[PDB]
Symmetry: C3
């Protein structure tokens, strides 16, 4: 079933609309390109001053705190990379609002006592972006993902870790292996993130349309 | 050997040509972004009223029929996703014609009696696009793929299905695992789709250049 | 730690800057799209007349020589494909210089006496691009990669080759499986390419900033 209630500017349009969607698509791609390379000045430039992000391993975080704990994770050997997999934009020109839709694979490299493995999670980043009236610059205020499917990837093609059914069961279908593997590192995993189906799926689309309509949104789903 | 007989607008150029290639590249990315999310209003907006698409599992279909059977497949648990892998455009400004070249991986999740597995097929979508003279809007009239290579992907890193040599043999090299796995679902697989080499490879490039030259094309290869 | 000493034009900006970054991002994507399809006229159009490229299997090569040996490799059955994984640009408008940052997976299909396998190497292509003052056209003068991680991929989901520890040990971490598998084909592998960490990582960022500052660069790291 079509999750969108209406249509927004997403293809063709004026040169101004094309260039707005291009600018927003660049912001989205900044997450994989700059985070994976620890280009923190570039990464911070993507966001509003009051921005919040959500991940499986951090839950919601103000962006500056997210950068702090990301640096700490990287210093402790955490190795998360991204593959961007298709980016388009929904633009609301009169509201100065846009949604960036960026398909991706989160590909995180782990060790098991040594057995190397990736967990690859196909997902869709949703960037809630706004245009500064004065400068015309787009910035992201919120980033939250849909989680679609995941898998365990052997690095040598022979050996892979083992997860019990009970170890995987507490996580939503879509990020069970990613959640379980990150939990083994000691992280407290957010279990209230949207997947391909269900309650939080409709909720995410509701908040996306609220944003594009100009409202405040409610992406804080534990209170 | 270089399959192109000549060169078209593909890099640099005027701002108008850059923005035309950008608009066409967005159309291409609409297939992965909108089909994977069942955003059917957005997906239908990519196409002309008389558009036709080709897939391994459907053969040629008018786009509205393709949407109907895609919805039916999804209701029956079919789980096809796409990873877009690099998109560029060949533009013929005087003909109001363009070809979108979108590298992708078709990644389809299957079950085997239960063993979960993906088949990942590296391919290249070819979007035959035309510009409305009145509105200036680009739309896709035809979509057909080159199929380059495929593989079976274990989801848990340990278990994978088994395909006999005879089960794989009827399919062209490039989509043998994808065809064989989709056939197990009951689909009648199109065996006349182009791959990295051979008769239909040259034919596809011939039709691409015919389109860019302004002709009608013949992508219907069974009559 | 943030490897960049300063910031360049990378998001938002004027329409002219947006369109310059778009044009450079297209050049980058030409490598996967045109090389994988043997579209050699298109591929050669990406480069300056005096361009040089670096790969694991060729070392540094003037681009026309690289095309010659790539054609020879393909005739001998070499099967390298690319998946583009996120592309952004650093622009220095006053210098007429840009750096294209293109995340990618090199995915090379091999045989072992027969066992089919891929090696997939996550990497970042760095395109050193310059703008022709007369025409305004962007072209790439240098292409060199960061190599981040790699893995062996079973094609049938059951069988995979075996590499000894000693066979992998001479290569930098980031492309050990890719180097080892290409060496089995008879290629002499360049061992002085940058990875996620260390001496050549800082050197690459130094040369990137030198380029953006307008200098000649020194990417020739064996003399
Ligand atoms: O940027 N990352 O590191 C991310 C972003 C979202 C996630 O859910 C995640 O597990 C990692
Ligand atoms: O969009 N899909 O579902 C597609 C498109 C082309 C294919 O050949 C296919 O097997 C699936
Ligand atoms: O284009 N290719 O064939 C490439 C480019 C860089 C590499 O390091 C490589 O092994 C292959
Ligand atoms: Ca604008
Ligand atoms: Ca709330
Ligand atoms: Ca136009
Ligand atoms: Ca015909
Ligand atoms: Ca320009
Ligand atoms: Ca030197
Ligand atoms: K991509």
């Amino acid at each position: 079933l079509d999750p969108h209630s209406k249509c927004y500017s997403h293809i063709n349009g004026s040169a101004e609309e094309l260039l707005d969607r291009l600018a927003v698509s660049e912001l989205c791609k900044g997450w994989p390109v700059y985070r994976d390379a620890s280009e923190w000045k570039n990464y911070r430039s993507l966001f509003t001053e009051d921005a919040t992000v959500w991940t499986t391993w951090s839950g919601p975080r103000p962006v500056d705190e997210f950068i702090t704990i990301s640096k700490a994770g990287k210093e402790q050997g955490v190795f998360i990379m991204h593959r961007e997999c298709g980016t388009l934009v929904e633009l609301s020109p009169q509201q100065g609002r846009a949604i960036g839709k960026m398909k991706a694979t989160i590909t995180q490299r782990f060790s098991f006592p040594a057995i190397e493995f990736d967990v690859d999670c196909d997902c869709r980043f949703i960037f809630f972006c706004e245009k500064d009236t004065a400068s015309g610059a787009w910035k992201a205020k919120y980033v939250k993902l849909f989680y679609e499917k995941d898998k365990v990837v052997s690095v040598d093609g022979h050996q892979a870790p083992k997860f019990t059914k009970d170890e995987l069961a507490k996580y939503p279908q879509g990020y069970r292996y990613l959640g379980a593997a990150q939990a083994r590192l000691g992280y407290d995993i957010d279990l209230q993130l949207p997947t391909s189906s269900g309650q939080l799926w409709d909720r995410m689309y509701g908040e996306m349309e609220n944003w594009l309509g100009g409202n405040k949104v409610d992406l804080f789903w534990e209170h």
